[PDB]
Coordinates of C-alpha atoms and ligand atoms in Angstrom, one line a residue:
X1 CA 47.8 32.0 82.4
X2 CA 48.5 28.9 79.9
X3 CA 51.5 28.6 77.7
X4 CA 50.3 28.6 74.2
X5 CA 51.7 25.3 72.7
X6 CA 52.7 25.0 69.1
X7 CA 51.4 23.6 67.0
X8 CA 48.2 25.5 67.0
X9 CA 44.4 23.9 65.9
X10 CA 43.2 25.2 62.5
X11 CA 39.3 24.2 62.2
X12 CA 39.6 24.9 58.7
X13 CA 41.6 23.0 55.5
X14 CA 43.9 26.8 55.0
X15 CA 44.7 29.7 56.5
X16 CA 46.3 30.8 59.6
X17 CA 44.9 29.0 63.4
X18 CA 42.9 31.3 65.9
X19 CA 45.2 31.2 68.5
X20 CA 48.2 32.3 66.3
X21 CA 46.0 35.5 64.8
X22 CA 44.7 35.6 69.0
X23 CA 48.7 36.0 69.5
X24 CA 49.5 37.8 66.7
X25 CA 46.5 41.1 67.8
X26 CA 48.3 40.7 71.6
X27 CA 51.6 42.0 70.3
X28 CA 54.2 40.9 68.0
X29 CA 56.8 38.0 70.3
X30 CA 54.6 35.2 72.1
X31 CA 56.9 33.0 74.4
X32 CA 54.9 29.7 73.2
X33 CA 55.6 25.7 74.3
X34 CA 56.2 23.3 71.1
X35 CA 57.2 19.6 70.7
X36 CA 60.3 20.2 72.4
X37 CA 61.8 23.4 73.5
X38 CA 59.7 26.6 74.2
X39 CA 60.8 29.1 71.9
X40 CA 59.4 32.6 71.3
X41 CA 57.1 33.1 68.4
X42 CA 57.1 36.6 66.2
X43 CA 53.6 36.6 64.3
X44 CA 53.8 40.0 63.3
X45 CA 55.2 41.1 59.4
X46 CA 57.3 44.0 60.3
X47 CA 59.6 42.4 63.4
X48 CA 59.4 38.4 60.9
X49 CA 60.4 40.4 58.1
X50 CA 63.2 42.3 60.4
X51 CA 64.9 39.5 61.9
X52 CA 64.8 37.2 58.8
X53 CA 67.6 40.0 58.1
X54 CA 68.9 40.4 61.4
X55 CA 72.2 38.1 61.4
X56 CA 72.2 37.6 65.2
X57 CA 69.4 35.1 63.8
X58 CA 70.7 31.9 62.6
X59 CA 69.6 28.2 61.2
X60 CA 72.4 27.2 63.2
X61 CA 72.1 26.2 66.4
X62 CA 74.8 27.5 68.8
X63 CA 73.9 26.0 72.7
X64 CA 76.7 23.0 73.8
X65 CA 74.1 20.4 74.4
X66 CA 72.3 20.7 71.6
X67 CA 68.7 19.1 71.9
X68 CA 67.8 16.0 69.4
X69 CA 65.7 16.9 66.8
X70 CA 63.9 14.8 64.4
X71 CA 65.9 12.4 61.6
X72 CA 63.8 15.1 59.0
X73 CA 64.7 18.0 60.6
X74 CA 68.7 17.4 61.0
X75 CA 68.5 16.1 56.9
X76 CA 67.1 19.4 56.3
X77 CA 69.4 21.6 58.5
X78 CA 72.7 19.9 57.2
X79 CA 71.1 20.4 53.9
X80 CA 71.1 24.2 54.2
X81 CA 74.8 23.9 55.6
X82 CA 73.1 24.4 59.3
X83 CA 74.1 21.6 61.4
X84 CA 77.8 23.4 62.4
X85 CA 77.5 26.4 63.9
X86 CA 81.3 27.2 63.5
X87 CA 81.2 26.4 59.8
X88 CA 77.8 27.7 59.0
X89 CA 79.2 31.6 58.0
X90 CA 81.8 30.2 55.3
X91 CA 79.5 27.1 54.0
X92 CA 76.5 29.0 53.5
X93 CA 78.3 31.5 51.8
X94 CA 79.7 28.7 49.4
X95 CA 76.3 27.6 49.2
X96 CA 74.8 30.1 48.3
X97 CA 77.3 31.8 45.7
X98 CA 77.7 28.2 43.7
X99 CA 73.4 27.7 43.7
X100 CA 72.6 32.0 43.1
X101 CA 74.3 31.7 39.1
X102 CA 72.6 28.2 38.4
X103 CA 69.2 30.0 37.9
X104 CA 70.6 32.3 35.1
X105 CA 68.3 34.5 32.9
X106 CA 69.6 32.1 30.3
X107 CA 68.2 29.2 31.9
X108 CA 65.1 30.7 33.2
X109 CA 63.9 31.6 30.1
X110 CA 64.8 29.2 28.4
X111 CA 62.7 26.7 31.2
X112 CA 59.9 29.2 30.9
X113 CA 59.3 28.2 27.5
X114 CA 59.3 24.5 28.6
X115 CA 57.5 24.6 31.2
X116 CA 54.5 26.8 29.1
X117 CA 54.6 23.6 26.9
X118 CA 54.5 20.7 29.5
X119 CA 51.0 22.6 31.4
X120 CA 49.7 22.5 27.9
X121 CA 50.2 19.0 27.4
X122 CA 49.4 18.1 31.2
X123 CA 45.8 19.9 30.5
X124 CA 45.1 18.9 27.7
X125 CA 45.7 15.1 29.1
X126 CA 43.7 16.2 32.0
X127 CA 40.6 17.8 29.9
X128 CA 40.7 14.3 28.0
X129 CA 40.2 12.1 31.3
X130 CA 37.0 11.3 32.9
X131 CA 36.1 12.6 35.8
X132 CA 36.9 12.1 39.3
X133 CA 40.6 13.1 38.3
X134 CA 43.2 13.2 41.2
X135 CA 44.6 16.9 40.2
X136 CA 47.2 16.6 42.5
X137 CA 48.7 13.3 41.0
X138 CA 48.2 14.5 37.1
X139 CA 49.1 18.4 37.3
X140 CA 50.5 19.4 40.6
X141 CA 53.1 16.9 41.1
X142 CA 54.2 16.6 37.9
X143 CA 54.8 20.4 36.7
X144 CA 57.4 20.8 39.6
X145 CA 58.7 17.2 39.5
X146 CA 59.1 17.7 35.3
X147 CA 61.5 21.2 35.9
X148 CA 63.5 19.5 38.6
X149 CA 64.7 16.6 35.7
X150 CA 65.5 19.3 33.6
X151 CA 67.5 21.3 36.0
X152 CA 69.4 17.9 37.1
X153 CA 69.8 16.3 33.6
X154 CA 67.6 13.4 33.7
X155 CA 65.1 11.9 31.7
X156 CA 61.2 12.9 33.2
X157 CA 60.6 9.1 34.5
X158 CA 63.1 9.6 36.7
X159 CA 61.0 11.4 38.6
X160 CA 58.8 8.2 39.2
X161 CA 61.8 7.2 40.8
X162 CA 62.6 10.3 43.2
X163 CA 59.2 11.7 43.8
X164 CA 58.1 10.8 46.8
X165 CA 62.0 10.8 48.2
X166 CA 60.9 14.4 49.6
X167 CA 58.0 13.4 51.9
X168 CA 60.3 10.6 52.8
X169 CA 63.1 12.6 53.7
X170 CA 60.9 15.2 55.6
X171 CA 58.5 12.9 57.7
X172 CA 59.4 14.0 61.2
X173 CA 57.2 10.9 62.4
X174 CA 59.4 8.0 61.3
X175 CA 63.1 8.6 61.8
X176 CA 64.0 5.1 60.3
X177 CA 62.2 5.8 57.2
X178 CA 63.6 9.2 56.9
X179 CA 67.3 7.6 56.9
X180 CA 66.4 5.1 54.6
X181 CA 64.8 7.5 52.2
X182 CA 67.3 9.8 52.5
X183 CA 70.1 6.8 51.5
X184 CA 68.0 6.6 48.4
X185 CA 68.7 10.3 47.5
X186 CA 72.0 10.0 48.4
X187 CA 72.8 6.8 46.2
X188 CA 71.2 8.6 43.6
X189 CA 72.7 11.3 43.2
X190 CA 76.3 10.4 43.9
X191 CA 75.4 8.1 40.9
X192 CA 74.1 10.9 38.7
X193 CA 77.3 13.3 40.0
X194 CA 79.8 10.2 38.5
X195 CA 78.0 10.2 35.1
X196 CA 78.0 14.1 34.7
X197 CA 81.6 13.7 34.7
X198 CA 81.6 11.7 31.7
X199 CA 78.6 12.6 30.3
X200 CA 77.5 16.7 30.8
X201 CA 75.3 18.5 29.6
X202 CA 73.2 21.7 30.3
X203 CA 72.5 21.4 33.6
X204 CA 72.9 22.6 36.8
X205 CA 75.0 19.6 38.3
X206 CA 77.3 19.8 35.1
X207 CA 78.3 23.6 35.6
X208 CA 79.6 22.6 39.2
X209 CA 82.0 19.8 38.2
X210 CA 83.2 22.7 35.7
X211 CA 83.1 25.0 38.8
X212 CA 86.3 25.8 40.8
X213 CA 88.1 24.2 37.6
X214 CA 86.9 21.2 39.2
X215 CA 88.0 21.7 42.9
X216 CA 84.5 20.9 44.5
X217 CA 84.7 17.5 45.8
X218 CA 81.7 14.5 44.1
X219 CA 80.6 15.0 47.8
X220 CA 80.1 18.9 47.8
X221 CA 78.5 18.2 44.2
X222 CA 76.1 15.4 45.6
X223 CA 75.1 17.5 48.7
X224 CA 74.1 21.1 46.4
X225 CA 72.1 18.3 44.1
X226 CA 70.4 16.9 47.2
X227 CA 69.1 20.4 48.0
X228 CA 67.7 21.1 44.5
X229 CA 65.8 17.7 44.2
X230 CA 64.6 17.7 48.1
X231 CA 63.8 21.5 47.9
X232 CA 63.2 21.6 44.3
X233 CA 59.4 20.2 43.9
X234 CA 57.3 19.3 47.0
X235 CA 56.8 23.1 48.3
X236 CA 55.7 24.2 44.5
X237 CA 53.3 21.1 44.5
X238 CA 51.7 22.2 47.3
X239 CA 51.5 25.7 46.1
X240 CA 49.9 24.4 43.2
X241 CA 47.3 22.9 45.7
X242 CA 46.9 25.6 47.5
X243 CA 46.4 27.9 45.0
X244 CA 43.4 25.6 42.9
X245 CA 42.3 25.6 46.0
X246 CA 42.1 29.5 47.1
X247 CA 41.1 29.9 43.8
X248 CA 38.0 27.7 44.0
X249 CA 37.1 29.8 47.4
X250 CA 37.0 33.2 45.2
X251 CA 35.3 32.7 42.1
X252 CA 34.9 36.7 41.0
X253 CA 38.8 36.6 41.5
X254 CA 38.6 33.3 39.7
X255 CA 36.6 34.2 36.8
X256 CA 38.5 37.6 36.0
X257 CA 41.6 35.3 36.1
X258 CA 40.2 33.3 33.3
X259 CA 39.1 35.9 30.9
X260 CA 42.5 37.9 31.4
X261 CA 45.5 35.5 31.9
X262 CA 47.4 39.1 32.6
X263 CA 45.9 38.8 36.1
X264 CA 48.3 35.5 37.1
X265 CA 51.5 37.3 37.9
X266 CA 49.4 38.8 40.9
X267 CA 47.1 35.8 41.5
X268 CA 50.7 34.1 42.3
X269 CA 51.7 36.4 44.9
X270 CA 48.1 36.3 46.5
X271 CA 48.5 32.6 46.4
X272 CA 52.2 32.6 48.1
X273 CA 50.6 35.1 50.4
X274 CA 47.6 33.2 51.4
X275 CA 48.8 29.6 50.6
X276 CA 49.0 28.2 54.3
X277 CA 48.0 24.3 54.6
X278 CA 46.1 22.8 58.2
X279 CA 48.5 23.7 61.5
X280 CA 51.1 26.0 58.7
X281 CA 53.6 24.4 61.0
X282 CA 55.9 24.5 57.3
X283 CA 54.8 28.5 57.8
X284 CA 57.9 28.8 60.0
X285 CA 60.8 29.5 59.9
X286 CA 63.3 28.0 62.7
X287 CA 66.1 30.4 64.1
X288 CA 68.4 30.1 66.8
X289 CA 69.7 33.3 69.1
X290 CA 73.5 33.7 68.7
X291 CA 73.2 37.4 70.1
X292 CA 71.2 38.8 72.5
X293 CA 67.9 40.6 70.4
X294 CA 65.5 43.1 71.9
X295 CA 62.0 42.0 70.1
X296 CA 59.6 44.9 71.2
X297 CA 60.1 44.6 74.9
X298 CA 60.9 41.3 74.8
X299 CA 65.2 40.2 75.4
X300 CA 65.4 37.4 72.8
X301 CA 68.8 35.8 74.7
X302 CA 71.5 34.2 73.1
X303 CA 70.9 30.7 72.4
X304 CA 67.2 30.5 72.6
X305 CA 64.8 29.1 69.7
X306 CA 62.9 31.9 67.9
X307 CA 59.7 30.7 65.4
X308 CA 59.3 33.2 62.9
X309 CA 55.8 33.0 61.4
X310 CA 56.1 34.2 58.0
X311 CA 52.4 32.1 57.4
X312 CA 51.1 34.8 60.2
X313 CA 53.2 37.5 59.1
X314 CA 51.8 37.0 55.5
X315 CA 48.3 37.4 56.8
X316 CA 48.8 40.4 58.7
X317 CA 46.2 43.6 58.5
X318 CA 49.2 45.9 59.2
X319 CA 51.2 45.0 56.3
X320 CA 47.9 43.7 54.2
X321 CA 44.9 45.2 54.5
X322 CA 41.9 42.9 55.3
X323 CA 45.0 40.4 55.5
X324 CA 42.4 37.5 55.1
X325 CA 40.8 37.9 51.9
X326 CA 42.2 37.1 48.4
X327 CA 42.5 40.0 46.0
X328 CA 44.2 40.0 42.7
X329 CA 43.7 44.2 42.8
X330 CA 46.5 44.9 45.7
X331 CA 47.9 48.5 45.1
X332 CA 51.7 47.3 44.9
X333 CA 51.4 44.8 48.0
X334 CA 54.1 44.8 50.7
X335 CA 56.3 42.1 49.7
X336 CA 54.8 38.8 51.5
X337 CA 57.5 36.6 53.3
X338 CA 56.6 33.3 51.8
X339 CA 59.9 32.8 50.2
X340 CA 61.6 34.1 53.7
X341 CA 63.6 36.8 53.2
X342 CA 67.2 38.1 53.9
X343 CA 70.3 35.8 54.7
X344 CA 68.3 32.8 53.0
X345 CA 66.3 34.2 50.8
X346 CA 64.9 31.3 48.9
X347 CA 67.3 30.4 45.4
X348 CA 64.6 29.1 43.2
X349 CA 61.6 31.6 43.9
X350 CA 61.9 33.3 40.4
X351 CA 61.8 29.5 39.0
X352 CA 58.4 28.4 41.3
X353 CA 57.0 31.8 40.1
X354 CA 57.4 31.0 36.9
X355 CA 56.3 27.3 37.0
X356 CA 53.3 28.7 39.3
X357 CA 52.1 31.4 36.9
X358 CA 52.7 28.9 33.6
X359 CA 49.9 26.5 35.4
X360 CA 47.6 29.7 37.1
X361 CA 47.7 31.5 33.2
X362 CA 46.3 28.7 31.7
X363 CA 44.3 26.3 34.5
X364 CA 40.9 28.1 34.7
X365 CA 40.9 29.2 31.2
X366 CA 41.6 25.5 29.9
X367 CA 39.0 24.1 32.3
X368 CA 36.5 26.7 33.5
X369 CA 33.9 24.7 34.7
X370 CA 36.7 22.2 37.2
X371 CA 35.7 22.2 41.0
X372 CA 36.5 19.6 44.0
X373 CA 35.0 16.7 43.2
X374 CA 34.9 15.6 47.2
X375 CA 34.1 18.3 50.0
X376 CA 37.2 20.2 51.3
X377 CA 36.5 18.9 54.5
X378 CA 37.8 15.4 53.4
X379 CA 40.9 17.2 52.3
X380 CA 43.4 16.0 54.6
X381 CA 46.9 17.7 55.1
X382 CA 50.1 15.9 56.3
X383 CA 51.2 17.5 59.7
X384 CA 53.6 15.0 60.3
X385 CA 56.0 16.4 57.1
X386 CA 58.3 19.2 57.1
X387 CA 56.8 20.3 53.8
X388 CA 53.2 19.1 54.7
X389 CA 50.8 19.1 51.5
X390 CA 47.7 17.5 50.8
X391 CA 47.6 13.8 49.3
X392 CA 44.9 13.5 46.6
X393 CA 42.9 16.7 45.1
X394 CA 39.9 15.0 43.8
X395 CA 38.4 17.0 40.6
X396 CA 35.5 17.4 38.1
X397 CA 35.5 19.5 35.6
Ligands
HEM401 C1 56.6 27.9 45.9 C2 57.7 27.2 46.1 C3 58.7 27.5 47.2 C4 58.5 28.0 48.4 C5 57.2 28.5 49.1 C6 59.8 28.1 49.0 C7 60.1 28.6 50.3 C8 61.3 28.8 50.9 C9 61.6 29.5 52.1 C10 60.6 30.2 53.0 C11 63.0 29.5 52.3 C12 63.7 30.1 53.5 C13 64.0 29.1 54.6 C14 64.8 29.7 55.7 O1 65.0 30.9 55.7 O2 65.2 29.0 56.7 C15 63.6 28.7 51.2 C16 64.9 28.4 51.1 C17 65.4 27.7 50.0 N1 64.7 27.3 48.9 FE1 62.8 27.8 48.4 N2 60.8 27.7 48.2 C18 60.1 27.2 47.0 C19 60.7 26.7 45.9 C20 62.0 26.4 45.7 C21 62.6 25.9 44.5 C22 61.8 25.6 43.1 C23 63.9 25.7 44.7 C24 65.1 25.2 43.9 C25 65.0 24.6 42.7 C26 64.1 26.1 46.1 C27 65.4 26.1 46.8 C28 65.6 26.7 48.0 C29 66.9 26.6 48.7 C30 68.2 26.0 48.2 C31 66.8 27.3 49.9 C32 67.9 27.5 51.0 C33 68.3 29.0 51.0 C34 69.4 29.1 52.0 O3 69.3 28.5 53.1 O4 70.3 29.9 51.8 N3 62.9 26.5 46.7 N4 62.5 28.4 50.3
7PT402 C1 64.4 24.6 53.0 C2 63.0 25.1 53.4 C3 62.4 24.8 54.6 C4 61.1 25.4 54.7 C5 61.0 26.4 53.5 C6 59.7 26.3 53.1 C7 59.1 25.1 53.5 C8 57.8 24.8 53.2 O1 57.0 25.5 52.5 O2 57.3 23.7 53.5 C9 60.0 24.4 54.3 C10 59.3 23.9 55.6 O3 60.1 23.9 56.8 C11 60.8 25.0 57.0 O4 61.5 25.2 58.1 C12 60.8 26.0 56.1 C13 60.0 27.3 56.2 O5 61.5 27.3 56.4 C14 62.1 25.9 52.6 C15 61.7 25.1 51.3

């Protein structure tokens, strides 16, 4: 008997650890140790997929003394209106109902048109350079950062500016530099909120000063425009990583992708699918218990911490066959979990589809003959962030 203890070795660069797929063939609810309190851990698709819509199971947490959490962790919680559990039902609901019309089929399309045109011009710049070329810094980053400065209204070199304000934010290692980065956000965007006043235009933080005939406080504003730019970019960065990267590993998959660009719609969801980074500690989802749950035969009790492993889940031979291996030829595949699924759903997963399958369409047909430049070995991803990620992809081509 030894308490499994999050968070779990991975020998290799992707995938899902070991222990967790050792877990995961056990049964479906592992009660598991972690950096602070025990929790259970779900690893299997159908009970993950069943409590992420099973409302007993909350981001809130609901115990009197609650436990201190990293500075990262409480920025991100009281960004998703989590950090009250007797407000959390009516703020969410806000939340969600002034974020769900910003990502219009207006606006969608016309970003998808956009964002066709800025890969274009980000590959083209990257076919001119000499290699070793840092994908990561020249295509990854700047796809996602590019969108979020058009949803917010703000010329692209402001993104030089808030770029990096997301790792800051999220690093659960350094609480002092998670306030201060945070600080930065804030100043930022109670400065942009002030100028959209005066100055609108079409975006997103425009249509909620028109919202409520104008009864949402600057704050309320500000806070809705902190979760777009902190949520906004990093996690489709690192899904552009991840997905050069898988896509490297299969090269028949690879190659069919270049000749028909058809084939990136469902290259996207195998990446989401498959796209788990080191430990895939961002590959779960944190609940709290505010009923009693039976899991299996397991009594989830009110109050406890559940982990649900949508990484694991997303990997699973029960819901995917031969979970493991990439394959752009899934009969109609079970709907993976990366983008969570019921109460919070994610908001902008038909915009990081879009921006992912712009980039996937043209990547391999633009530059056929790109590969790491390093091995993937000296690929080294950041455990100590929320959001995780790789820091350089070096490339030839
Ligand atoms: C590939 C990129 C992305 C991935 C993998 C991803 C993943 C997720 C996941 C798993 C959740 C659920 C978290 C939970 O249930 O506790 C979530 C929530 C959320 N995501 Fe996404 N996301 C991505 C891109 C985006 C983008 C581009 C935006 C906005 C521009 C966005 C905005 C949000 C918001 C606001 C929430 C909170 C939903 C809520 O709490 O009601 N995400 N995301
Ligand atoms: C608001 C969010 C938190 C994430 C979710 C996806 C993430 C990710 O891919 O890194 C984050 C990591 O931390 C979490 O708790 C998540 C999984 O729930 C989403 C963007």
């Amino acid at each position: 008997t030894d308490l499994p203890r999050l968070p779990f070795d991975n020998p290799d660069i992707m995938g899902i650890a070991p222990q967790m797929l050792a877990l995961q063939k056990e049964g479906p609810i592992a009660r598991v140790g972690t950096a602070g309190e025990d929790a259970w851990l779900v690893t299997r698709y159908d009970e993950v997929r069943t409590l992420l819509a099973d409302r007993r199971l909350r981001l809130s947490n609901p115990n009197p003394q609650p436990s201190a959490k990293s500075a990262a962790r409480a920025f991100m919680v009281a960004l998703m209106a989590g950090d009250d559990h007797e407000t959390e039902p009516a703020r969410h609901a806000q939340m969600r109902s002034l974020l769900i019309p910003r990502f219009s089929t207006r606006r969608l399309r016309l970003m998808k048109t956009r964002i066709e045109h800025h890969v274009d011009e980000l590959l083209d710049q990257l076919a001119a350079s000499a290699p070793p070329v840092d994908l990561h810094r020249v295509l990854s980053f700047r796809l996602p950062t590019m969108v979020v400065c058009d949803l917010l209204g703000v010329p692209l070199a402001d993104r030089e500016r808030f770029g990096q304000w997301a790792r800051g934010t999220f690093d659960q290692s350094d609480n002092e530099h998670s306030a201060n980065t945070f600080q930065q956000v804030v100043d930022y965007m109670l400065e942009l909120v002030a100028r959209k006043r005066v100055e609108p235009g079409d975006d997103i933080l425009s249509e909620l000063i028109a919202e409520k005939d104008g009864a949402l406080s600057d704050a309320d504003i500000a806070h809705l425009g902190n979760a777009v730019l902190l949520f906004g970019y990093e996690t489709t960065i690192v899904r552009i990583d991840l997905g050069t990267l898988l896509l490297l590993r299969n090269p028949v998959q690879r190659a069919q992708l270049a000749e028909d660009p058809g084939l990136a719609p469902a290259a996207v969801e195998e990446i989401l699918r498959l796209g788990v980074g080191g430990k895939g500690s961002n590959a779960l989802i944190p609940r709290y218990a505010h009923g009693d749950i039976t899991v299996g035969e397991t009594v989830i009790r009110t109050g406890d911490a559940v982990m649900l492993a949508i990484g694991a889940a997303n990997y699973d031979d029960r819901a995917f066959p031969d979970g493991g291996l990439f394959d752009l030829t899934r009969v109609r595949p079970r709907s993976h979990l990366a983008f969570g699924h019921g109460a919070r759903h994610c908001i902008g997963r038909t915009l990081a589809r879009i921006e992912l399958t712009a980039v996937f369409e043209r990547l391999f047909r633009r530059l056929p003959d790109l590969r790491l430049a390093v091995p993937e070995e000296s690929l080294r991803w950041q455990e100590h962030r929320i959001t995780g990620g790789f820091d350089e992809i070096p490339v030839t081509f």
